[PDB]
Amino acid sequence: QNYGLNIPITGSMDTVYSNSTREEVFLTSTLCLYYPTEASTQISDGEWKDSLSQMFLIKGWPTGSVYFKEYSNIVDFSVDPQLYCDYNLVLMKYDQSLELDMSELADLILNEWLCNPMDITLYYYQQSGESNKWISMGSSCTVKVCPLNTQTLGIGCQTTNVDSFETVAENEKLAIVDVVDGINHKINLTTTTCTIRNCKKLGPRENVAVIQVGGANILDITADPTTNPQIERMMRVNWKRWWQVFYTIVDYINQIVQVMSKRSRSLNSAAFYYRV
Amino acid sequence: ASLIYRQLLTNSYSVDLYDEIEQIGSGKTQNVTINPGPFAQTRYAPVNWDHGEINDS
Numbered sequence: 001q002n003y004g005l006n007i008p009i010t011g012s013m014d015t016v017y018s019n020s021t022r023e024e025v026f027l028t029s030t031l032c033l034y035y036p037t038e039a040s041t042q043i044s045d046g047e048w049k050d051s052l053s054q055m056f057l058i059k060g061w062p063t064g065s066v067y068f069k070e071y072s073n074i075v076d077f078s079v080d081p082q083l084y085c086d087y088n089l090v091l092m093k094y095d096q097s098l099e100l101d102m103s104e105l106a107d108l109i110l111n112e113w114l115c116n117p118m119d120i121t122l123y124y125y126q127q128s129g130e131s132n133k134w135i136s137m138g139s140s141c142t143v144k145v146c147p148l149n150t151q152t153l154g155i156g157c158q159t160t161n162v163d164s165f166e167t168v169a170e171n172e173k174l175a176i177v178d179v180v181d182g183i184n185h186k187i188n189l190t191t192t193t194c195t196i197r198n199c200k201k202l203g204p205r206e207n208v209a210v211i212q213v214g215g216a217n218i219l220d221i222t223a224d225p226t227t228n229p230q231i232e233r234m235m236r237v238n239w240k241r242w243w244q245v246f247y248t249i250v251d252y253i254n255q256i257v258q259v260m261s262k263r264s265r266s267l268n269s270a271a272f273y274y275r276v
Numbered sequence: 277a278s279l280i281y282r283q284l285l286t287n288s289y290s291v292d293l294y295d296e297i298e299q300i301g302s303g304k305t306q307n308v309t310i311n312p313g314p315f316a317q318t319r320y321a322p323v324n325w326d327h328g329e330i331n332d333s
């Protein structure tokens with residue numbers, strides 16, 4: 001245990017495999033499911049928590065090791081979603097006009113974000129590169145950004161007139177805003193009800209997987225227009241009955257966990273880098 | 277003295293008899309499994325108070 005340093009490992013390409021770890025991942029981890037309240041509404045039952053738990057036990061997950069966490073809806077769940085858990089699954093009923101909100105939430109939760117504060121009232125901010133964004137979270141975020149010259153004079157906006165400022169996000173719970181990189185900006189965001197953080201994009205967060213229950217592939221986690229990839233952890237499924245959705249989850253839970261993996265930053269291996 | 281472990285493994289079948297004994301010894305209870313579905317509490321009725329049946333003549 002030699003934390004912190006980046007030491008080069010070495011391995012032989014002729015060694016053999018080892019015994020499967022399926023038993024361990026069932027018997028030690030904790031599965032964790034987030035669903036919308038309309039799920040329980042359509043279920044209209046209420047020992048169904050116990051029913052699902054026992055089905056999970058048949059699949060191999062001990063009784064106390066599977067957690068359920070109802071959330072109201074996508075927009076109100078995206079406001080600081082804390083996945084303090086071990087193997088996270090997030091169901092999302094796709095609906096029209098929530099494409100960007102759902103994609104923002106997926107981008108927020110499926111990747112490790114390193115966030116520093118932002119004192120809007122005092123400093124003028126910047127974006128180091130493509131890996132930097134500003135995530136605003138609150139009850140009502142209305143980010144108004146005014147870019148600046150090299151001499152601290154606004155362009156397309158006056159530094160004193162929030163009317164002249166340009167609106168980039170308006171009255172949404174979660175706003176992962178990007179702007180031009182290398183241009184100082186002056187922000188105004190309603191500080192009493194919407195915090196904002198200057199965040200950097202680390203590697204991917206394998207701990208959580210997203211399940212779009214509704215329509216077609218839309219989730220563009222990569223803010224770059226060019227690349228719109230399809231990650232293994234962005235799963236999609238059709239549906240008419242929430243019972244059928246949950247039974248599919250339980251039946252294929254081993255495959256879902258195979259798609260996912262333990263958080264890289266939750267381990268002692270990542271102790272002195274950005275462990276959390 | 278290595279045969280202690282061999283003997284315990286070989287004779288382990290007697291723990292079934294021991295389990296039967298402790299089962300006979302132990303007192304027992306059971307459940308009356310609870311009902312779900314009090315999802316609709318019910319009020320009395322629309323009730324209005326009035327004087328009874330006056331006995332006129």
Ligand SMILES: *[C@@H]1O[C@H](CO)[C@@H](O)[C@H](O)[C@H]1NC(C)=O
Nearest residue numbers: 017018019020021022023024
């Ligand atoms: C690996 O699994 C096989 C059967 O699945 C078992 O016989 C073997 O003992 C296991 N390996 C070890 C080191 O126990």
Ligand SMILES: *[C@@H]1O[C@H](CO)[C@@H](O)[C@H](O)[C@H]1NC(C)=O
Nearest residue numbers: 120121162187188189190191
């Ligand atoms: C944003 O603009 C409003 C006026 O619309 C102003 O009252 C408020 O102080 C501004 N926010 C900040 C952080 O300066």
Ligand SMILES: [Ca+2]
Nearest residue numbers: 156157164165
């Ligand atoms: Ca303007």
Ligand SMILES: [Ca+2]
Nearest residue numbers: 101172174175
């Ligand atoms: Ca949003």
Ligand SMILES: [Ca+2]
Nearest residue numbers: 127178179181
């Ligand atoms: Ca940028």
Ligand SMILES: [Ca+2]
Nearest residue numbers: 222224227228
């Ligand atoms: Ca993209």
